[PDB]
Write an enzyme that holds these catalytic residues in place. Structure first.
Site, short mmCIF file in Angstrom:
data_model
loop_
_atom_site.label_atom_id
_atom_site.label_comp_id
_atom_site.label_asym_id
_atom_site.label_seq_id
_atom_site.Cartn_x
_atom_site.Cartn_y
_atom_site.Cartn_z
N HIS A 84 0.81 -1.22 0.00
CA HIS A 84 0.00 0.00 0.00
C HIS A 84 0.84 1.28 0.00
O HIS A 84 0.26 2.36 -0.09
CB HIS A 84 -1.02 0.01 1.16
N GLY A 135 3.36 5.92 10.19
CA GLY A 135 4.73 5.72 9.76
C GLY A 135 5.33 4.40 10.16
O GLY A 135 6.45 4.10 9.73
N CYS A 184 4.22 1.32 9.50
CA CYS A 184 4.09 0.23 8.53
C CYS A 184 5.45 -0.19 7.99
O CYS A 184 6.37 0.62 7.87
CB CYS A 184 3.17 0.60 7.37
#
Ligand SMILES: *C(=N)[C@@H](NC(=O)[C@@H]1[C@@H]2[C@H](CN1C(=O)[C@@H](NC(=O)C(F)(F)F)C(C)(C)C)C2(C)C)c1cncc2cc(F)ccc12
Ligand SMILES: *C(=N)[C@@H](NC(=O)[C@@H]1[C@@H]2[C@H](CN1C(=O)[C@@H](NC(=O)C(F)(F)F)C(C)(C)C)C2(C)C)c1cncc2cc(F)ccc12
EC number: 3.4.19.12
Lengths: 306, 306
Positions: free
Chosen positions: A41, A143, A145
């Site tokens: 993503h 942030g 991920c």
């Protein structure tokens, strides 16, 4: 003595973390040999992430659309591809700090260490369990991920988790390192929700054994119970069934303490029916279920990693 | 969101740990530049450690009595001296992995990460507080002496603790890195004991603010209290007095949540007088006192270290 939620030393993982930017989205990647792994993503925009279509979105990207920061050093992306829900960014430099590693998928009930990361910079380390409902009760902000979960077995890092998303109850969902989600979650912005959880019975028993090793004995009793009558009781209090294999796994801990597994089940039975009556176990007023039998043997015996 | 006991990434410390052998005693040392730091009781034998006399014991030793193992590589000791309760072993190689560091002494109430180590090999990392009685509730077995506690402030490691000994209640005692014990403990085998503890009030308040940030609000109330009437209440439940400076330190957390510090004290008052009535806060059924206001701002805002 003593008993803490203890993570693996994180240095070997710290040397793999990098920053991946695509457009205005920045997140973390994992750099092993000449590949950087990160959540797919990253290629989505705010309006993309409603019902995104990743094959379409990825063919519209070029190697130069991906900025990879290894500390204060940039890495040319020389190739990119999608594997399930992760991106594989081929870069022109092999990570010289690449440890011996494996990609493994864990079972609900097992534990691992999480190296929380922002902008490719490690922030902190902590221990999590994979819940029966395939979420993890992490600690993650925007942030984070791309941060990974892992175990260390002597010198080899077994990566098991990459962080993708936070669910509305504040728990966290993600994939193994091949990009396959843990549980029924998707990297879209839907109304998805955790789904009902259970307590990990074998782990609670392991933690009662850790308590006995560290001198808490007030919850012991002479009583006993059968596996069936205990599993009856677990089912009422929303505990997972205990199997014969769980009893076997608890063998070493049973032998070290002299408390037969089924005797400890009778103790757990009483604790479930009576509560703790204002007392504590290993500094907790709740029954703790995020230590495996392995974890307990690890701190109460003292194994290292090199 | 979420809230965990979170340690600092340990890699920078892992690269400093070594094994120190003298006689039949093996423990851990900390290797910075060309010096290895370790507990001075390494030079003692079983019968030495009853009432030892360290200046006498040390003049009887030679550089070659100290075996230092850095991984699978030996280091010549070229000098040795005592500084308070630690030994300084001068070696012929500067540690190429030496981070930027400081030796700092912490206050009871402050937290730090512990890299538990055996035979110079890091085993696990976890978070501890310095108790008001100058013990720490660690997790340590034989061979763990010399393991260090530390904090990381951007890129600089502030070492604050070196492990020396376990007290009879199963808590742990040690020194700062200049060899001065935390609290009234000595590196002899006497009948020494922890001494009575208190709960760290300002930390409990910080953790209630973390709970509000993560959506636990059931313990809030409209009530208020004055600092004096609260400090009255803390004293009965064996809590430390709250000072105006504690109230100031809690300012940022007060402002982010909209809950005045003294209002949260009224909540804590009620929690102390009524218990929690079967509910939980941040997954705990007890009031947690091992997160500082700094720690809370760290996870609930998300600062990293490089
Ligand atoms: C990673 N840096 C970040 N996560 C995301 O951006 C993921 C990712 C898209 C949105 N999202 C979410 O986590 C959202 N959650 C959901 O859509 C759902 F609830 F899970 F369904 C949300 C609402 C922003 C939290 C996709 C789902 C693929 C990330 C990682 N950990 C924690 C947070 C906390 C935040 F407040 C924001 C972003 C987080
Ligand atoms: C370190 N590897 C080890 N500690 C020691 O050997 C220290 C050291 C001498 C004995 N000792 C102790 O910790 C003992 N404790 C005490 O004398 C006292 F209770 F604190 F007073 C004891 C009885 C072996 C635990 C000196 C006091 C200077 C070490 C470190 N952490 C934990 C343990 C646990 C153990 F079972 C044995 C040794 C430990």
């Amino acid at each position: 003595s003593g008993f803490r939620k203890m993570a693996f030393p994180s240095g070997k993982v710290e040397g793999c973390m990098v920053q991946v930017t695509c457009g205005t989205t920045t997140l973390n990647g994992l750099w092993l040999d000449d590949v950087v792994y990160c959540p797919r993503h990253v290629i989505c925009t705010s309006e993309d992430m409603l019902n995104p279509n990743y094959e379409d979105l990825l063919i519209r990207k070029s190697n130069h659309n991906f900025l990879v920061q290894a500390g204060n050093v940039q890495l040319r992306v020389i190739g990119h591809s999608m594997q399930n829900c992760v991106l594989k960014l081929k870069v022109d430099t092999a990570n010289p700090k690449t440890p011996k590693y494996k990609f493994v998928r864990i079972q609900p009930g097992q534990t691992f260490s999480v190296l929380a990361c922002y902008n490719g910079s490690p922030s902190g380390v902590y221990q999590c369990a994979m819940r029966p409902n395939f979420t993890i009760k992490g600690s993650f902000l925007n942030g984070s991920c791309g941060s990974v979960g892992f175990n260390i077995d002597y010198d080899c890092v077994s990566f098991c988790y990459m962080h993708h998303m936070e669910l509305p109850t504040g728990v966290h969902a993600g994939t193994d390192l091949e990009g396959n989600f843990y549980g029924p979650f998707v990297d879209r912005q839907t109304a998805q929700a955790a789904g009902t959880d259970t307590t990990i019975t074998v782990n609670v028993l392991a933690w009662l054994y850790a308590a006995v090793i560290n001198g808490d004995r007030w919850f012991l009793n002479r009583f006993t119970t059968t596996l069936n009558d205990f599993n009856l009781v677990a089912m009422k209090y929303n505990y997972e069934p205990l199997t014969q294999d769980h009893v076997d796994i608890l063998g070493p801990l049973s032998a070290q303490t002299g408390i037969a597994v089924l005797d400890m089940c009778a103790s757990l039975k009483e604790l479930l029916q009576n509560g703790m009556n204002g007392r504590t176990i290993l500094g907790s007023a709740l029954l703790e279920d995020e230590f495996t039998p392995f974890d307990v043997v690890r701190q109460c015996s003292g194994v290292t990693f090199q």
